[PDB]
A paper describes a structure:
Bacterial lipooligosaccharide PEA-transferases such as MCR-1 are organised into two domains: an N-terminal inner membrane-bound domain predicted to contain 5 transmembrane α-helices and a soluble, periplasmic domain containing the putative catalytic centre. The two structures are essentially identical (RMSD 0.37 Å over 311 Cα atoms) and reveal an overall α-β-α fold, containing three intramolecular disulphide bonds, typical of alkaline phosphatase or sulphatase enzymes, with the N-terminus indicating the likely position of the five transmembrane helices.
To facilitate such studies, we engineered MCR-1 to lack the five transmembrane helices, generating a construct containing residues 219–541 (MCR1ΔTM) which was purified and crystallised. Phases calculated from datasets collected at or near the zinc X-ray absorption edge ultimately yielded structures for two different crystal forms in the space groups P41212 (1.75 Å resolution) and P21 (1.55 Å resolution). However, the two crystal forms differ in zinc content, with the P21 structure containing one zinc ion (Zn1), coordinated by Asp465, His466, Glu246 and Thr285 in a tetrahedral geometry, while the P41212 structure contains density for an additional, also tetrahedral, zinc site (Zn2) coordinated by His395, His478, a water molecule (Wat1) and Glu300 from a symmetry related molecule.
Author numbering: 219 to 413, 425 to 541
Write the structure that this text describes.
């Protein structure tokens, strides 16, 4: 219904330059201040720390404090100041734009769903990875809960099916959603014990996300010969863990504590892509996601031209 980027155009197409392949990990309930890179006293991201090419952003603010509110905003043209959750799904979003310009879009979801973001695109481009019908990694724990790494299975098939095209893959993580954080990770990540126990479980869940992001990057690396590959991670909101008597998330922005809106963001790219990240301490928000995705595929749109991205 409401358009934002009818003028959008891709400056270069994949027939005259290397095609581009991006994984966008849409994170869940992760707090910036529980990231080792941001000064946390526990090493919650030990695998990512060993990977060259990873930029950590230390000053990122979410649009809101819930999945329902934040996720459509992350893909919106409006920005946090203008965003309206009720009317979001009736507006053209950045995936609509990229799809129209020929970028192959895939959304795998181990969270809930895309909160309206994928609704205008063909049903076949969204896939529910919360069920063992699609996810091959579900029986590794007492709860039979499907794991985020299951979303990486068979992604080569998608690349093959779309070979030579630009591709953007969204992987919507279960991540750190609670309150039962101890359910969110398999036993091999139960590092911080006992499961304060609530904090420990929270940090163990971050370890499993560290693992998932690291494996996402490794998967991308295997395609770097044929594709310009990059990985963007941003959490949809943080989490209160008892500060001032506040717990969980979803607090209205007017009263939301810092903990619920201070989120981690990472960017990784292969050396050959020529993509340059912004400074780690750039003042950033969820508003930066749409311009970042457009830039990664060499797309310009009038509405977002003044906007700061995660990359130059
Ligand atoms: Zn939630
Ligand atoms: Zn969420």
């Amino acid at each position: 219904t409401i358009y934002h980027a009818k003028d959008a155009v891709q400056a270069t197409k994949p027939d005259m330059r290397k095609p581009r392949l991006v994984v966008f990990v849409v994170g869940e309930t992760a707090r910036a201040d529980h990231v080792s890179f941001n000064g946390y006293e526990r090493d919650t991201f030990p695998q990512l720390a060993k990977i060259d090419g990873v930029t950590n952003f230390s000053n990122v603010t979410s649009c809101g404090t819930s999945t329902a509110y934040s996720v459509p905003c992350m893909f919106s043209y409006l920005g946090a100041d203008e965003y309206d959750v009720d009317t979001a799904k009736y507006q053209e979003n950045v995936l609509d734009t990229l799809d129209r310009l020929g970028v192959s879009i895939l959304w795998r979801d181990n969270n809930s769903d895309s909160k309206g973001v994928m609704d205008k695109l063909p049903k076949a481009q969204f896939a529910d990875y919360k069920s063992a019908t699609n996810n091959a990694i579900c029986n590794t724990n007492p709860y039979n809960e499907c794991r985020d790494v299951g979303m990486l299975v068979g992604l080569d098939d998608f690349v093959a099916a779309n070979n030579g095209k630009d591709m953007l893959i969204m992987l919507h993580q279960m991540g750190n959603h609670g309150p039962a954080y101890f359910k969110r990770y398999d036993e091999k990540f139960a590092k911080f014990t006992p499961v304060q126990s609530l904090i420990n479980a929270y940090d163990n869940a971050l370890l499993a996300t560290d693992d998932f992001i690291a494996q996402s990057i490794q998967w991308l690396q295997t395609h770097s010969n044929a594709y310009d590959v990059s990985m963007l991670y941003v959490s949809d909101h943080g989490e209160s863990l008892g500060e001032n008597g506040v717990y969980l998330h979803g607090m209205p922005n007017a009263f939301a504590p810092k903990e619920q809106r201070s989120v981690p963001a990472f960017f990784w790219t292969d050396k050959q892509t020529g993509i340059t990240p912004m400074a780690t301490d750039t003042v950033l928000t969820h508003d930066a996601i749409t311009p970042t995705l457009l830039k990664l595929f060499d797309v310009t749109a009038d509405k977002v031209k003044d906007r700061t991205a995660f990359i130059r």
